[PDB]
Design an enzyme around this catalytic site. Structure first.
Site, PDB file in Angstrom:
ATOM      1  N   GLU A  27      42.719   7.078 -20.403  1.00 50.38           N
ATOM      2  CA  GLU A  27      43.215   6.986 -21.771  1.00 50.38           C
ATOM      3  C   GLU A  27      44.749   6.834 -21.814  1.00 50.38           C
ATOM      4  O   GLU A  27      45.252   6.375 -22.816  1.00 50.38           O
ATOM      5  CB  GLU A  27      42.792   8.168 -22.654  1.00 50.38           C
ATOM      6  N   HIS A  64      39.392  12.456 -22.342  1.00 52.49           N
ATOM      7  CA  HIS A  64      39.902  11.852 -21.142  1.00 52.49           C
ATOM      8  C   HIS A  64      40.321  12.954 -20.190  1.00 52.49           C
ATOM      9  O   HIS A  64      40.912  13.979 -20.591  1.00 52.49           O
ATOM     10  CB  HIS A  64      41.098  10.912 -21.409  1.00 52.49           C
ATOM     11  CG  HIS A  64      42.314  11.521 -22.029  1.00 52.49           C
ATOM     12  ND1 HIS A  64      43.316  12.084 -21.229  1.00 52.49           N
ATOM     13  CD2 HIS A  64      42.727  11.569 -23.319  1.00 52.49           C
ATOM     14  CE1 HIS A  64      44.271  12.493 -22.071  1.00 52.49           C
ATOM     15  NE2 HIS A  64      43.976  12.201 -23.354  1.00 52.49           N
ATOM     16  N   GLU A  66      41.447  15.098 -28.765  1.00 50.63           N
ATOM     17  CA  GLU A  66      42.918  15.038 -28.625  1.00 50.63           C
ATOM     18  C   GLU A  66      43.534  16.165 -29.429  1.00 50.63           C
ATOM     19  O   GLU A  66      43.018  16.652 -30.432  1.00 50.63           O
ATOM     20  CB  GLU A  66      43.432  13.737 -29.202  1.00 50.63           C
ATOM     21  CG  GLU A  66      43.022  12.473 -28.371  1.00 50.63           C
ATOM     22  CD  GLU A  66      43.717  12.306 -27.079  1.00 50.63           C
ATOM     23  OE1 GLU A  66      44.510  13.127 -26.585  1.00 50.63           O
ATOM     24  OE2 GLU A  66      43.494  11.267 -26.385  1.00 50.63           O
ATOM     25  N   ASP A  83      46.882  18.247 -23.569  1.00 46.81           N
ATOM     26  CA  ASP A  83      46.417  16.874 -23.642  1.00 46.81           C
ATOM     27  C   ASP A  83      45.750  16.492 -22.346  1.00 46.81           C
ATOM     28  O   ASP A  83      46.382  15.894 -21.432  1.00 46.81           O
ATOM     29  CB  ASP A  83      47.624  15.940 -23.864  1.00 46.81           C
ATOM     30  CG  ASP A  83      47.234  14.543 -24.132  1.00 46.81           C
ATOM     31  OD1 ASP A  83      46.039  14.215 -24.296  1.00 46.81           O
ATOM     32  OD2 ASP A  83      48.238  13.780 -24.154  1.00 46.81           O
ATOM     33  N   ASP A  85      42.284  12.097 -17.477  1.00 41.69           N
ATOM     34  CA  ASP A  85      43.585  11.770 -16.941  1.00 41.69           C
ATOM     35  C   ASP A  85      44.670  12.495 -17.687  1.00 41.69           C
ATOM     36  O   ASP A  85      44.543  12.881 -18.857  1.00 41.69           O
ATOM     37  CB  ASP A  85      43.876  10.303 -16.852  1.00 41.69           C
ATOM     38  CG  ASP A  85      43.839   9.541 -18.127  1.00 41.69           C
ATOM     39  OD1 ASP A  85      42.942   9.762 -19.005  1.00 41.69           O
ATOM     40  OD2 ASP A  85      44.713   8.652 -18.347  1.00 41.69           O
TER      41      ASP A  85
END
Ligand SMILES: [Zn+2]
Ligand SMILES: [Zn+2]
Ligand SMILES: [Zn+2]
Ligand SMILES: [Zn+2]
Ligand SMILES: [Zn+2]
Lengths: 375, 376
Positions: free
Chosen positions: B134, B67, B163, B100, B69
Site C-alpha cells: 500500500e 496492508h 488505516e 500505520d 507494509d
C-alpha cells in the site's frame, strides 16, 4: 568619396570591447587636429572620454557617440571575423559596423568636407566620445556632461550617432527615448501540502487579482511623441517542483519603459497601491536604469529632415521607441538633441553590418546638417 | 481486559516489512485465523504478496482491509527506541507500523476471535484483504486483488479499511469517503522578444492573467454533507530565465484538484478548457488523474461504527472525507458500504511513530462491536 568607408574600417578593426578604447579616441583627435579641433581627455575610472572642439562661440553643434562595442561571442559563429571588416553582398560586416563606428567615421569626414568648404563658418563643432556606452556607463558620457555643465559649456544642437533607421537610411530619427524602471516582487504565502489548503497561503492565488490589474492598467495615454508607458512581466517563478505542494512564495520581475507622461515615483506608488488594495503581502526591490528625454519638433528635427530629403529622397519619421542612448545624459546640456544613424537591425548580433551605399549617404546627411546649422 | 491485541501488534511490528517485503506477516495472520475457520488464498502479483482470508460463504460479507507494509524508518539513530523493537513507554506503544497500520490488523484479528467465540453460528461471512504494498507504487497490491474478486463475483457488503483515522482521541473520526485527484500541466504559448518592443512579442504571463484569476476564484461545487468544496490549487508557475529585458516565450503552470463526488473528472476538464478558451489563451494542457473520489453515504455501516465507538470509547464520532486517499478507492468498486477506521494518525510515517496503549483494546472492541451489530 570613400574616406568614410576607409575610416569606418579602420575603427572597426580595433577590438574596443567595453570599456577598452583601443586608441580610437587618439586616432580621432590626431585626425581632427589638422582642422582646429582642440582635444580634451576626460578619463574617469577605467573609461576614456574625449571632448573635441573646433571654435569658441555659439552655436555649438555636437556629435556624440561611443567607441566601445559589445562582445562578439565565439568568433566561429560569425561568417567573417568580427574585427576584420569585410565587404560582401553590398554590406560592410564587423562588430561596430552599425553600432556605431560607421556613424563616427561619417561625422569625421563630414567635418573635414565642411571645414574645407567653409573655413570661416560661424559657431563651433564638437565631438563627445566615450569608451563606455554599452556597459554600466557610469564613468562615460554622464561624467563628461557634468564637467561641461559645471563650467557652462553648453550645446545648442546635438546629434547622437546611434543607429536609428528601420529599413532605409534616413527613414527614422529619434527625438527622445523612454526611461526604464524595474521591479523585483516576492509575494509571500505559506508553504504546505496541497490537500490541506487551510494550513497554507497560495501566493499565486493571492497575487492573481493584482496581476490582472497590473497587466490591464493604463499608466498614461502617450502623446504626440511617445507611445503609452509600457508595463511588461519578464519573469515569474513559484513552487518547489512538487505537484502536491502549495508554494511559500512567488517571484515576479517586471519593467516599465515610461514616457515623459509618467514619473518613476508615480509608477512605483501606483504599483504598491494595486498590491496593497488586494491584500498582497510582499517584498519589492526597485531599480531605475534611466530617465526619459525629449526634444520637441523644431529647428533640429526640421534640419535633419531637410538634409535627409536632399540626400536620401525620403521623409524621416520622428520616433521615441526602442531602447535608450547617451542622449539621456546629454539632453540636460543640449537645447535640441536627436539621434541619427544607419539601420539598427543587426545591432548587438552576429554578422552585424551596414549597407555600403548608406555610408557616404550618412556622411552627406551629417554634412548637410552642419551646413544648415552653421553656414 | 484482553492483552491479545497488544501482543499481536508487537509481534507484527517486530517484522521489518518495509514495502514490498511482507516478512511473513501474512503467513502469521493466515495461520492464526485458520484456527477459527478462515480459509486462505494467497495472491502473489510480482513482488507483492496479498491474502484473501475468509470465514463463511454467504452474505452479509464483512471485510477488513489493510496492508502489512510499512514506510522506511530513516536513520535509525534518530529514533528514541529501535523502530522494529516495539516499546511501551509513557502510555504509548512505539514502533514503525504502530499507527500505520499493524495495530489495526492485530485488533481486527482478535476481534474476530472474540466475536466468533461468542457467536459460533453468526450469519454471513468475515474476510480480510491484506496487501504487502500500500505504501509504494502499489501497482500489484489491493487493486489487483479487487480485480480478481470482481471477476469471480465475490462481492463485499461492508468493508472496514483499518488505516488510522483518529485525529486526537480514538474514534473521533471515521472516513466515509475520499476526494479524487486531477492534475494539469499547462504550457501557455507566447512569443519571446525584447521587452522594449512588446507589440512584436506575446507575453504569456499577460495572456494567462485573466484566466488565472477566473480559475483561482471559481467555485467548482458547493460541497455536501460529507465533502468540502472541490479544491483547486496552483502548485507551480514558471516563465523566463532571469533576463529582465526579455518577454518570455512560454509559461509553465501546474495545478491540482482534490475533487468530491459533486464534480466529475470530465466536467472539471471541460470547465478549465472553457475558461482558458474564453480568454483567448493559446496553450497545451496535459492531464493526469491519480484517483477518483468515493463515498458511502450515512447508513448502516456508519451507524454501527458510531454506535460501537460511543459504547467503547464514550466519544461521538464524526464522518470525514478530508486529506489524501486510501486503498478504499479500489475496494469501493466491490463493497457496497466502506469506511476507514483506525487509531491516531498523528504520527504516521514519522520517527517515534506510536499509538496510545489504552487505545489498543478499545479499537479491537470497536471492531468486535461492528461485527456483532452487522452479523449477530
Ligand atoms: Zn550604440
Ligand atoms: Zn549598442
Ligand atoms: Zn502509510
Ligand atoms: Zn496505511
Ligand atoms: Zn453477542
Amino acid at each position: 568619396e570613400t574616406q568614410s568607408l576607409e575610416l569606418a574600417k579602420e575603427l572597426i578593426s580595433r577590438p574596443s570591447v567595453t570599456p577598452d578604447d583601443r586608441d580610437c579616441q587618439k586616432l580621432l583627435a590626431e585626425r581632427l587636429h589638422k582642422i582646429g579641433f582642440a582635444a580634451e581627455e576626460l578619463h574617469f575610472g577605467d573609461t576614456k572620454n574625449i571632448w573635441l572642439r573646433r571654435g569658441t562661440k555659439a552655436p555649438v553643434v555636437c556629435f556624440a557617440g561611443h567607441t566601445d562595442v559589445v562582445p562578439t561571442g565565439p568568433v566561429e559563429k560569425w561568417d567573417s571575423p568580427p574585427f576584420e571588416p569585410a565587404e560582401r553582398d553590398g554590406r560592410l560586416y564587423g562588430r561596430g559596423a552599425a553600432d556605431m563606428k560607421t556613424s563616427i567615421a561619417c561625422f569625421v569626414t563630414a567635418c573635414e568636407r565642411f571645414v574645407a568648404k567653409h573655413p570661416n563658418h560661424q559657431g563651433s563643432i564638437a565631438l563627445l566620445i566615450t569608451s563606455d556606452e554599452e556597459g554600466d556607463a557610469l564613468d562615460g558620457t554622464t561624467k563628461v556632461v557634468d564637467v561641461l555643465k559645471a563650467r557652462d559649456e553648453l550645446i545648442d544642437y546635438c546629434i547622437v550617432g546611434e543607429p536609428t533607421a528601420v529599413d532605409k537610411l534616413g527613414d527614422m530619427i529619434k527625438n527622445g527615448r523612454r526611461g526604464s524602471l524595474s521591479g523585483n516582487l516576492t509575494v509571500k504565502g505559506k508553504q504546505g501540502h496541497i490537500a490541506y489548503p487551510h494550513l497554507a497561503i497560495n501566493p499565486v492565488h493571492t497575487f492573481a487579482p493584482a496581476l490582472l490589474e497590473l497587466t490591464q492598467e493604463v499608466w498614461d495615454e502617450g502623446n504626440e511623441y511617445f507611445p503609452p508607458t509600457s508595463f511588461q512581466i519578464s519573469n515569474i517563478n513559484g513552487g518547489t517542483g512538487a505537484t502536491n505542494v502549495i508554494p511559500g512564495e512567488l517571484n515576479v520581475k517586471f519593467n516599465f519603459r515610461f514616457s515623459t507622461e509618467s514619473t518613476e515615483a508615480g509608477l512605483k506608488q501606483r504599483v504598491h497601491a494595486i498590491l496593497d488594495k488586494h491584500g498582497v503581502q510582499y517584498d519589492l526591490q526597485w531599480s531605475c536604469s534611466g530617465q526619459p528625454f525629449l526634444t520637441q519638433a523644431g529647428k533640429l528635427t526640421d534640419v535633419a529632415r531637410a538634409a535627409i530629403a536632399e540626400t536620401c529622397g525620403i521623409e524621416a519619421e520622428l520616433s521615441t521607441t526602442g531602447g535608450t542612448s547617451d542622449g539621456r545624459f546629454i539632453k540636460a546640456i543640449a537645447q535640441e538633441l536627436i539621434e541619427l544613424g544607419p539601420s539598427n537591425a543587426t545591432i548587438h548580433q552576429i554578422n552585424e553590418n551596414v549597407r555600403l551605399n548608406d555610408i557616404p549617404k550618412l556622411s552627406a546627411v551629417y554634412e548637410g546638417i552642419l551646413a544648415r546649422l552653421l553656414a
